[PDB]
Design a protein around this ligand. Structure first.
Ligand SMILES: NC(=O)c1ccc[n+]([C@@H]2O[C@H](COP(=O)([O-])OP(=O)(O)OC[C@H]3O[C@@H](n4cnc5c(N)ncnc54)[C@H](O)[C@@H]3O)[C@@H](O)[C@H]2O)c1
Ligand SMILES: CC(C)(CO)C(=O)C(=O)O
Length: 305
């Protein structure tokens, strides 16, 4: 017997983690937004996970942010633009020894979450697992992936990693986790903004070879000035590699705009532009790219941040 896994943000990845953790015998508790969400979830009976067309019900225990026991280990699995507000809703339940697993893409929310929960350890995650919602409390395990974990302040790995190994959650500890998240971010900036502006699948960016190179050019300077020469070196070939590998998919940001939902631009292309200005590094093509993408979002009534 050991620590309960508290899950905040019962979305795509949050339900996928909650299912694999709870079904492997580990103590797991979903933190649902409010009691209405809670009594709906109890009318549903649990989380429904769809694997290769097969649905399975996982009657995981759930609660609201106000009730329950202290939280010593929490998996934050909401969007980056909700992470700070989400973590604050349970700040009254963190224990001081509490550790937080931040399953947020991009950068910005992790620092903002850690700033508001100083008595708690905030670990950074970077995941390539595919999962999408098919109704409330139903998630399809779309694609297998890998999750890098790491703490920039406390680089020693926690002993509960092997619990994730027991649960079949593939992960690797990284001592330079910031180098990981910066690699995924730079890849996002080179691909996703143009997929939205050109309304194309990732394979459509082959028809824009020069423009892809100049963005990787400026994204290369940004990584180099940030201390990641390796990421800056392989960046262009890593971008061209992912393109042909995902040539048939629409990007996550293209899918967000298609559904009329908010994007994570403020923690991806916006954050990268914010960091470049902070580094005194002129990044004009990422700047005009950010301008065109923000106007593209406003044109549809979507938040440009
Ligand atoms: N395959 C994937 O889905 C995938 C892959 C890689 C990274 N990510 C990242 O994981 C994070 C979540 O992605 P997603 O697809 O699962 O989003 P999602 O919309 O499907 O899930 C978000 C859940 O958190 C809850 N949420 C938001 N704010 C909340 C709050 N203040 N209090 C309580 N709950 C709150 C939402 O209700 C929702 O159930 C994103 O940052 C994403 O970039 C997802
Ligand atoms: C960031 C990137 C390039 C990863 O494949 C992407 O296309 C997505 O998130 O949908």
């Amino acid at each position: 017997s050991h620590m309960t896994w508290h899950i905040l943000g019962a979305g795509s990845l949050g339900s996928l983690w909650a299912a694999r953790l709870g079904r492997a015998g580990l103590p797991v508790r979903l933190i649902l937004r409010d009691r209405q969400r809670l009594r709906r979830y109890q009318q549903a009976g649990g989380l429904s996970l769809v694997e290769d067309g097969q649905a399975s019900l996982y009657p995981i225990a759930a609660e609201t942010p106000d009730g329950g026991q202290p939280i010593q280990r929490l998996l934050l699995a909401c969007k980056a633009y909700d992470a700070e507000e989400a973590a604050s809703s349970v700040a009254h339940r963190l224990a001081g020894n509490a550790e937080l697993l931040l399953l947020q893409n991009g950068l910005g929310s992790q620092q903002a979450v850690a700033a508001r929960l100083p008595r708690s350890r905030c670990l950074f995650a970077s995941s390539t697992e595919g999962a999408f919602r098919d109704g409330d409390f139903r998630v399809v395990f779309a694609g297998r992936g890998h999750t890098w974990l790491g703490d920039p302040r406390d680089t020693n790995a926690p002993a509960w990693l092997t619990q994730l190994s027991q649960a079949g959650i593939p992960h690797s500890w990284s001592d330079d986790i910031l180098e990981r998240l910066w690699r995924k971010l730079a890849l996002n900036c080179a691909i996703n903004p143009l997929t939205v502006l050109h309304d194309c699948r990732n394979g459509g960016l082959r028809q824009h070879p020069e423009e892809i190179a100049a963005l990787c050019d400026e994204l290369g300077q940004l990584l180099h000035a940030s201390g990641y020469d390796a990421a800056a070196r392989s960046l262009l070939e890593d971008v061209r590699a992912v393109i042909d590998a995902t040539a048939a998919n629409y990007s996550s940001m293209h899918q967000d705009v298609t559904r009329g939902r908010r994007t994570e631009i403020g923690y991806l292309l916006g954050y990268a532009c914010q960091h470049g200005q902070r580094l005194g590094l002129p990044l004009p093509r990422l700047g005009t790219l950010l301008a065109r993408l923000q106007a593209h979002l406003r044109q549809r009534g979507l938040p440009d941040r």
